[PDB]
Structure formats: C-alpha cells, structure tokens
Design a protein around this ligand. Structure first.
Ligand SMILES: Nc1nc2c(ncn2[C@H]2CC[C@@H](COP(=O)(O)OP(=O)(O)OP(=O)(O)O)O2)c(=O)[nH]1
Length: 549
DNA sequence: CCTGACTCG
DNA sequence: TGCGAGTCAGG
C-alpha cells in the first residue's frame, strides 16, 4: 500500500497517451446530472490526479476524452459517459470495462466497485468506495489527498487487472461477449438514458386528481362493507378484518401472519364481496403512489423528461434492469393502469413513439435449443409449464383440481417431448459442471444444485431450466440493439432508442420516418440471430406510448 | 431497514 | 410446490 502519483495543477501532454486507465468519479448512486468530484489517469508515463474544474475545461483533455483512438480502460464506463454528457462532454474510446468483465465472469459476486472486482484476482491495493465515502447521512467526499489516492488506486487497479480479466474471459469463451456485445451496448444505453423520455405532466396530474377521487370512493365502500375503518394498505390490519372480524377461511399464512395476497383474495370472492373491492383499491393505490406521484417526483421540471438508469451488471440471467424510475414495469395489462402510458410522449413536436416487441422469443429460443383474460392466463400456463411448475402451482393458478392440473402437464410434454428431454438433460449437466450457459456464452454458476436439501436443490434445478432460455433471449435483443443503431446511423435517420423492456424496443422519431421504421426495426430485430425457427416481431406507433399499440 | 403488496417481461 | 426484475406503504 505505497503508491506514488502526481496531484496535478494542470493537464500535460503525457496524460493524453493513446492507452490509459481512466477514472471519472461520481459518488451519487444516481449519476444523472451528478457532480464529477475527481479524475484519475494511469498510463505508461505515470499516475495522475486531476481536479474536474481544471481538466474538464481544458480543451486538450476534452479533445482526448472525445478521441476514439485514445483508448481508455474503466470501471462502469456508462456512469462516466453519462455524467460527462451532463457536463457537455463526449467520452469516446472506451476499450475495456472492468465492471462488465467481472459481471460476465460471475454475475453472483454482485461486483459494484473496483475493490470487489479486484478481490476476484487477489488484488488488494485499493479500498472499497463505501470505506472511503461512508454511508447514508454520513456520506461525503474526503479531503483531497485522501480522495486523490483512492481514485489513483482505482485507476492503477484497472490498469493491472485488465490483462488477468481478459485472459480469464478468453478461457471461458466470453471475451467477444464483452468486447463485441456488452461494451458496445453500454454506449447505446448511455445515449438512451441521457436522452430520457418526455412526460405530459398536465395529463399525468389530471389523472392523479381523478384517481384520488376514485380511491376515496372505493375506500369508503370498503369501510361500509367491513363495518369499520381500517388501513387497507396494511396487510396486518386487513388480515384482522378478513380473518378475524369477517371470519373468512385462512387459505395461506406466511411467517408474519395471514396472507392477503391477490391470489388468496381472488379465491375468497365466493365468501364476501369485499375482497374484490380491496383488490381494486390496492391496484388504484399503486397507480397513484408509484406511477403518478412517484413518477412526477423524478421528472426533471425544465425539460419534463425522466431519465432511467439501465443496470447492465445486476441480473443473474443477463437481462437489464431499470431504476429510478423503473420504466420496464409501466402498467399495460388492465386498461385502468394502461392509461398511464398516455403520459409518455415524444420529445419533439411532430414526432411519434414506435414500439416493437419480439413475439414469444423465449419459446422460440427453447424450440431451437431443445430441438383476452383467457389468453393472458394462457401465457402464464405456457411459461409456467416449460419452466417447471408443479401440479400444485398449476391447480392453484387455474383454480382447478390437482389431478386435472397434473394431466395438463403430462399432456403438454406429450406434445413437446423434446422440451421434456432437454429440461431433464440441462439439469443433469448443471450438476456435472456447476454452471449453465446461454447462446452467446453468458454463464451462471449454480453451486447449490447438488445440495442435500430438497428446497435448495430444487430451486437451483429450476434455474438450470430457466436461465439459459431467458438469458439467451437477453443476448439476442442486446445484439439487435447494437445492429439497430448501426443501421440508424447508416441511413442517417433521426430516430433513436428510448427504452428496452426485455423483449421490446421503444423508439421515437419524426412522423416522416415511420414508414422506414416499419420496415427497418422489425427486420433488424428478426435477423439479430439465425435460429432453427424464425424470430417474429410485432410493431406499432402512435402519438403517445399508449397509442403505440 | 424488512415484508408483502402491485407492477412488468 | 414456474423465473427474472423495482418501488411502494406500513410497521
Ligand atoms: N417473456 C416472459 N413472459 C412471461 C414469463 N412468465 C410469464 N410471462 C408473461 C408476461 C408477459 C407475457 C409474454 O408475452 P409473449 O411474448 O410470450 O406473447 P405475445 O403473443 O407475443 O404477447 P401479445 O399478446 O402482446 O401478442 O407472458 C416469462 O418467464 N418470460
């Protein structure tokens, strides 16, 4: 733990080498419009700390950041790229991202800072971010010499760790996954996050006003039916009303008490009408709390845009997630909630929203590898069965007899015996190897799969059945986004990606480009990979996200 | 902060 | 006793 570096007062030529480890430090978890608090550069010529005020106003440094021929190794280059966009600076030339490298090597390690990645290779000449900045109300940027040393140590670690990580990825056949898929995707997600999605706040606020009135009415109806006021949003208080006051059957308990889950309340409808009202209330209350109030809280007022963060190194299957706000769980399944999407509008006048979704991509992937309310329920049966639902679960979902449920499942595998063999085989392989893989060589380790405990082992077995299929579908749409943006640029279209929702891409564009997108977007998505079955994509466009159906 | 609710693929 | 996610109010 003894490391020389220069705390620089100005940028010099030797800091602008054609290969460097670069650290552009943003301390806040949400990096949109967040302060850059320090910069570090490590290259052949040495180690350097720079003050942001200095470096980011220096024309040669800004030029270097933006020069794609000056290669930078980083950790979480998307965080830096976006933070720099908010500072009006383009970052190009990122050739290695240690966060994504660590994630591919083992998504279970949950690597979220350089220190945690460093530990994978017994590197310890660097501290955890939390140890440096502290947490919660105590979180603060430390004294410059302490900050400077930390950033340098992080850069130095990225510098030394690149080779060992690349070598391990190659040994796993994951080097191309990193360099040709995840890393190019990171720059594309950076663009999407910075672009944001415009919100119609006038419409959203009016929806909220009307929703409050409706909640009040439903609320009073429930109190009338129950014969008492109580907090409906407390499962504990609700349980007392349902199972003690009204004396309804107790169908399920959890560790804290009586279950009031939606599945349970639906099953209680033959006993008391109040349960349907409560389900409605809890639906409405989530709309109001999360998709009206919560969404308005994160709208940037001057532009009316919301800027999500797509976490690229979180899920265990290779999917993305979306936070603050989550734009991947906006309501669509019931018309009442679906109307929320009318509030998501194009960012320019005379533009339109365009949405394209793969149809049953996971089921097509499985076929390749293995060789309205009714239809909504039928989807859960299809995915449920292939992913290992039991007769109990299926019976409970269709409210049918366990005997009947067992016959459906038997008959299902009768129709698709190759799916059956595959699921048996993939489980045995996971037990032998200790991991499963996707089409593009993404990996998930499953060390619980030989467990002597039934529950623990069974969960791992079902991960073996599910992760390769869900993860392959993730691999595919990731490749489609890369291929799609290349085509957009090639044709000089103004259209651009706004969102990915697992098997869906959401774009905005001038109305004039709608005809071209109707051909281009589905073509690119369908051709991202060639399976033994065709990939099918549906697409629609309209004045709001709601109308793009 | 955890649990159980509602939300999506 | 299908799987992958995030946010919220209540306690
Ligand atoms: N993608 C996916 N969806 C699941 C899973 N489990 C339940 N579902 C539900 C929620 C979303 C829905 C998926 O829709 P699909 O793409 O399979 O079918 P679709 O015919 O294309 O949908 P649509 O009615 O819009 O045309 O099924 C799962 O493991 N993966």
């Amino acid at each position: 733990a003894k490391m020389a570096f220069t705390l620089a007062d100005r940028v010099t030529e030797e800091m602008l080498a054609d290969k460097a480890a670069l650290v552009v430090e943003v301390v806040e978890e949400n990096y949109h419009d967040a302060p850059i608090v320090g910069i570090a550069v490590v290259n052949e010529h040495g180690r350097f700390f720079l003050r942001p005020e200095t470096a980011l106003a220096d024309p040669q440094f800004v030029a270097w950041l933006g020069d794609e021929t000056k290669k930078k190794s980083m950790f979480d280059s998307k965080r830096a790229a976006v933070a720099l966009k908010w500072k009006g600076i383009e970052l190009c030339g990122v050739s290695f991202d240690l966060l994504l490298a660590a994630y591919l090597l083992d998504p279970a390690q949950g690597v979220d800072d350089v220190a945690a990645a460093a530990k994978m290779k017994q590197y310890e000449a660097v501290r955890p971010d939390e140890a440096v900045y502290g947490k919660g109300a105590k979180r603060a940027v430390p004294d410059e010499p302490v900050l400077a040393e930390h950033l340098v140590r992080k850069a130095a670690a990225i510098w030394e760790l690149e080779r060992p990580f690349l070598d391990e990825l190659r040994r796993n056949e994951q080097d191309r996954l990193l360099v040709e898929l995840e890393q190019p995707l990171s720059s594309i997600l950076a663009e999407m996050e910075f672009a944001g999605v415009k919100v119609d706040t006038k419409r959203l606020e009016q929806m909220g006003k009307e929703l409050a009135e409706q909640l009040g009415t439903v609320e009073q109806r429930i109190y009338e039916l129950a014969g008492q006021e109580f907090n409906i949003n407390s499962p504990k208080q609700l349980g007392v009303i349902l199972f003690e006051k009204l004396q309804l059957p107790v169908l399920k308990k959890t560790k804290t008490g009586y279950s009031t889950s939606a599945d349970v309340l639906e099953k209680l409808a033959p006993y008391h009408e109040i349960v349907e009202n409560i389900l409605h209330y809890r639906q409405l209350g989530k709309l109001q709390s999360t998709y009206i109030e919560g969404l308005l809280k994160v709208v940037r007022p001057a532009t009316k845009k919301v800027h999500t963060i797509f976490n690229q190194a979180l899920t265990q299957t290779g999917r993305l997630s979306s936070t603050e706000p989550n734009l991947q769980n906006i309501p669509i399944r019931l018309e009442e909630g679906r109307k929320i999407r009318q509030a998501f509008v194009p960012s320019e006048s005379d533009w339109l929203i365009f949405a394209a979704d793969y149809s049953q991509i996971e089921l097509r992937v499985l076929a390749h590898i293995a060789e309205p309310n009714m239809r909504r329920q039928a989807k859960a049966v299809n995915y449920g069965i292939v992913y290992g639902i039991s007769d109990y679960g299926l019976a409970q979902n269709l409210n049918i007899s366990r005997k009947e449920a067992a016959e459906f499942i038997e008959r299902y595998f009768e129709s698709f015996p190759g799916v059956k063999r595959y699921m048996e085989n993939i489980v045995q392989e996971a037990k032998q190897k200790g991991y499963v893989t996707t089409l593009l060589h993404r990996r998930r380790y499953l060390p619980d799969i030989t467990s002597r405990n039934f529950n623990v082992r069974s969960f791992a077995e079902r991960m073996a059945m599910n992760t390769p299929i869900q993860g392959s579908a993730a691999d595919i749409i990731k490749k489609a986004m890369i291929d799609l943006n290349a085509r957009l640029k090639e044709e000089r279209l103004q259209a651009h990606l706004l969102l990915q929702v697992h098997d869906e891409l959401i774009l905005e564009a001038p109305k004039e480009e709608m005809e071209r997108l109707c051909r281009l977007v589905p073509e690119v998505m369908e051709q991202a990979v060639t399976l033994r079955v065709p990939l099918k994509v549906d697409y629609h466009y309209g004045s709001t996200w709601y109308d793009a159906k």
